[PDB]
Symmetry: C2
Amino acid sequence: SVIKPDMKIKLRMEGAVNGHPFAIEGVGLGKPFEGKQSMDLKVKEGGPLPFAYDILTMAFNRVFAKYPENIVDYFKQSFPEGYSWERSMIYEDGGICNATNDITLDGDCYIYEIRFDGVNFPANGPVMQKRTVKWELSTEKLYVRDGVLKSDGNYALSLEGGGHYRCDFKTTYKAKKVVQLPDYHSVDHHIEIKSHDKDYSNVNLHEHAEAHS
Amino acid sequence: SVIKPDMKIKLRMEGAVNGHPFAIEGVGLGKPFEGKQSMDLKVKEGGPLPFAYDILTMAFNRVFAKYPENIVDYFKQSFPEGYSWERSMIYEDGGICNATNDITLDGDCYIYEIRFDGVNFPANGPVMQKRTVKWELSTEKLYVRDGVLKSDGNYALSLEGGGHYRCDFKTTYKAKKVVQLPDYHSVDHHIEIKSHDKDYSNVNLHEHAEAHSE
């Protein structure tokens, strides 16, 4: 249809954590049918980031996920007009994050407009002390509530010096035009930071994702 | 003290709800020691607001609270340098808002810079359908955790045609300078929209708050 097997990505994020603003821009490319993408991200304002970069990675598009034939693919069907998502992320120690992304399609390139806001991360926590390592494999579960596609999952960040730090994700997905809705299914995400400079002013991020039922 | 019996307020709020941006500005006045204040608010971007105005009213300063002598007043002591707060609000139907306020003093005018972000309010909920009436009297409970003043509250909005719609508030307060921390105590808040135009582009908002303890 409108989905080429190789696509580009352009994005800008504006946001704040505990009231301190920052902005980040990125360019990437991926292969929506393989469910793989990668991108390079640069801090534009509010650098150097005084918090763990990992709370942002999942905010930096479910079109990049491999769907079998037997599962409805809400995300590929929603283009060219696009879709948006809303998301709340509740960390076990009271830290809470809200994000939105408005996704459009210009040529063979996706354009994200992302807003991100986190509050109540304690000063002695693993986020403000940058003591996180990586996200464990994430299983998102998607379902439909009143004509709207929703998902949630309970995820976990690995911690420096052992242990995990949990977080609960609730996301709402909205196509811009009416689209066929899927049945209950899961999506596994592997997300990883392959490289970065010391202060995370520059970051290279990869993700693989695949749906099941 | 730098806190005078009658003071002014200026504010700007920038936010978004379900991904749709807006901005509101306000002017007001109050009496710090009587724990009373009032203000007028005008939507400047994103009007008319497609959601219930009530989810914003508590974002629109604990310096305006009557503290008795036997409770430490963290807020009046934080000036002239000021203080800030961060806050999350979790409504029973999945709607979640975050806000921040940075509060400074200039002459005898408080200046707020407020950020507000709400997500996941369902289309058929009381918020997107503007079915809220008012906040019931709200009892905030403050305590200290690792050298920082926190608070929480279980609040409720009355709904059109009966029933209530519940929300959990969690706030962190941080003075700009080191200031003496209070003990556990409580604050009752009465907040009310005294008047507004048909679509809430103009709002006159009042609050009165009084601190209590054992």
